[PDB]
Amino acid sequence: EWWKEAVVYQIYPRSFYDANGDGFGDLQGVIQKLDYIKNLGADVIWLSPVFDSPQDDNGYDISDYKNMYEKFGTNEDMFQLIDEVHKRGMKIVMDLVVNHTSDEHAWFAESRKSKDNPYRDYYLWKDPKPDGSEPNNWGSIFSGSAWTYDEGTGQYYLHYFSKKQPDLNWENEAVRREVYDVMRFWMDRGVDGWRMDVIGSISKYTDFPDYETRSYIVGRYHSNGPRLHEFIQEMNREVLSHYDCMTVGEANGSDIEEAKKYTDASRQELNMIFTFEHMDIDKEQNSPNGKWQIKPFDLIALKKTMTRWQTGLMNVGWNTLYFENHDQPRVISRWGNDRKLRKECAKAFATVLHGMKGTPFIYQGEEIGMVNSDMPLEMYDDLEIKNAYRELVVENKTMSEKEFVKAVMIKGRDHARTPMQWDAGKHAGFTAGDPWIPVNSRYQDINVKESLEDQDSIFFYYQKLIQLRKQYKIMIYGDYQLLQENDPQVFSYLREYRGEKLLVVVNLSEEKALFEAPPELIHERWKVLISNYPQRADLKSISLKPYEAVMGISI
Ligand SMILES: O=C[C@H](O)[C@@H](O)[C@H](O)[C@H](O)CO
């Protein structure tokens, strides 16, 4: 159960470090930066997908599960990355993307040829409706229909995501055996675990029922299918149980109840899952514009959501802790202050997250306070944006252009994909060539070199938070309790374990705030473990400065 005590660093390798000088982040670049990650303190790295792919969705549309995409390097580089990680006492978690493949996968190239092709059923084909339209009104997460017509066989194929990401048919035993062969291949060669991409979708309602009704709908059939957990349970039986490993599911559509199904140790499925519920706090529940129909940051909602998850898996299953990844913007730009108070705010949000129960995940650049980009709309790369622009702005007109741009500047996935900022030199030292996407214009004041020089840096604050987690077992095994829950500025909570208490008090606003400990904690004595300002250790009453974070342990 080393995975309970781990801190995971997520690398998006095409934007981490270009060792070879082609403007593209590569595996040798990752190897060169292992020392830096270890120095931060993470003991597990999860690497976004580096398998062969036409890059329609930047790695998540795989055309070969057993070879690297050329621009990352070869398999000899990957096996070397694996050995270099293990050498440093670290673990490596690869991204398992098996809800769908690339339409350029060998399997799909055969499958599309005819109905009588051996691979036809590796994927999900349906006849049109009598009037020629799609088998149902299901939409793609990336806009338009979830169904694409093949003139050659007169049938549609299913894709929850891009037209170039046909969904696999998990009902087919051949397809599952194929996936397990892929997992076995890599785990035999030292991969310590998997992050499972949209694992919540692998089971379909095989009757493909319409939604009630404007034109295409994404909803409850797109996840949590009737055989989801059956399949995962088989995966565990056939594979995960043969190795000392770690598993984290990207559980799209997951609520607390579903989380227990995934994570309850007794069910022998997965160790932990990512949820979206705390990420969904700043969108309207059901608008045709989805994630792009944005709501202001609501602290109460954040507290309510995260707390439900802390208490829900408090004594059963296990939580993941994250605010950033390659699918999310920079949390400080999204929900806080990324200018004058950038460091305080980054530290605030870190403290809130790291003081909780579960496994923390640090997204590359989170640890130095990277921010959202001011790049123009035409400079974004993500297919999700271009597709949404076309649907929401051009065709349906459910968002003005100005409104669509505001939304992308807050929530566009590309805010997480501009290259990692290493120093203040050309392309922030990411590359000696021309980067695949431009570096954020603020890199000169926000980078690793300046961070490692400044003792007041966000980097050292993260380093210290990781150190404290290894030193104080209460941070890993304590329970959780929300305090002052109605406070519109302060997020405070308590952890308790074996007679010891850990009090976390974080002001997530730009104004002064007042924390007053509940009556029953008034006569506790505290040792301050960390704070983003200079700090008596007298915590019965704290006048909190803008974005001030305090973590204290009872003595
Ligand atoms: O909007 C977020 C994305 O839909 C993401 O969660 C998918 O996992 C990705 O495209 C890989 O398939």
Side-chain angles (χ1 to χ4, degrees), residues 82 105 339 471 485:
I82 295 172
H105 203 293
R339 295 289 183 167
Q471 189 181 354
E485 61 171 309

Side-chain angles (χ1 to χ4, degrees), residues 57 60 100 141-142 161 197-198 250 291 327 384 413:
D57 190 18
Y60 287 95
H100 45 264
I141 282 64
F142 300 147
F161 303 95
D197 186 59
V198 289
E250 180 187 23
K291 66 190 283 195
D327 294 326
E384 181 192 60
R413 303 197 294 177

Side-chain angles (χ1 to χ4, degrees), residues 162 164-203:
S162 92
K164 296 182 58 52
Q165 284 167 301
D167 289 49
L168 281 172
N169 179 24
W170 278 76
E171 307 289 315
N172 193 343
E173 219 174 1
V175 154
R176 310 200 298 270
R177 289 186 309 254
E178 296 268 16
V179 165
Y180 309 149
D181 286 4
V182 168
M183 298 172 78
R184 283 180 199 112
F185 177 75
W186 283 113
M187 295 173 86
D188 287 345
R189 290 166 177 74
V191 172
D192 298 297
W194 300 99
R195 178 275 193 178
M196 302 190 184
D197 186 59
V198 289
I199 192 66
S201 292
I202 60 168
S203 166

Side-chain angles (χ1 to χ4, degrees), residues 181-211 213 215-235:
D181 286 4
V182 168
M183 298 172 78
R184 283 180 199 112
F185 177 75
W186 283 113
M187 295 173 86
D188 287 345
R189 290 166 177 74
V191 172
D192 298 297
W194 300 99
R195 178 275 193 178
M196 302 190 184
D197 186 59
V198 289
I199 192 66
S201 292
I202 60 168
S203 166
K204 270 70 185 164
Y205 291 81
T206 57
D207 54 345
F208 303 95
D210 280 322
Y211 288 92
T213 260
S215 260
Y216 309 101
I217 297 177
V218 173
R220 56 68 138 272
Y221 300 126
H222 283 69
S223 61
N224 307 324
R227 305 185 74 189
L228 174 56
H229 300 285
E230 177 187 349
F231 292 151
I232 300 179
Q233 286 164 14
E234 185 191 34
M235 181 187 285

Side-chain angles (χ1 to χ4, degrees), residues 318-372:
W318 197 252
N319 265 285
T320 56
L321 302 165
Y322 82 91
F323 285 144
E324 285 191 11
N325 59 48
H326 72 291
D327 294 326
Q328 300 290 348
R330 298 290 177 177
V331 65
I332 59 183
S333 295
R334 188 192 185 154
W335 291 338
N337 174 293
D338 65 8
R339 295 289 183 167
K340 208 94 172 195
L341 289 161
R342 186 180 62 87
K343 298 182 192 177
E344 283 80 18
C345 177
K347 293 166 191 185
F349 277 104
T351 303
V352 172
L353 201 60
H354 279 254
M356 291 182 181
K357 186 175 194 168
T359 297
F361 285 72
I362 303 174
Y363 183 61
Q364 67 181 43
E366 185 188 331
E367 73 281 7
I368 72 173
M370 285 178 58
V371 296
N372 280 20

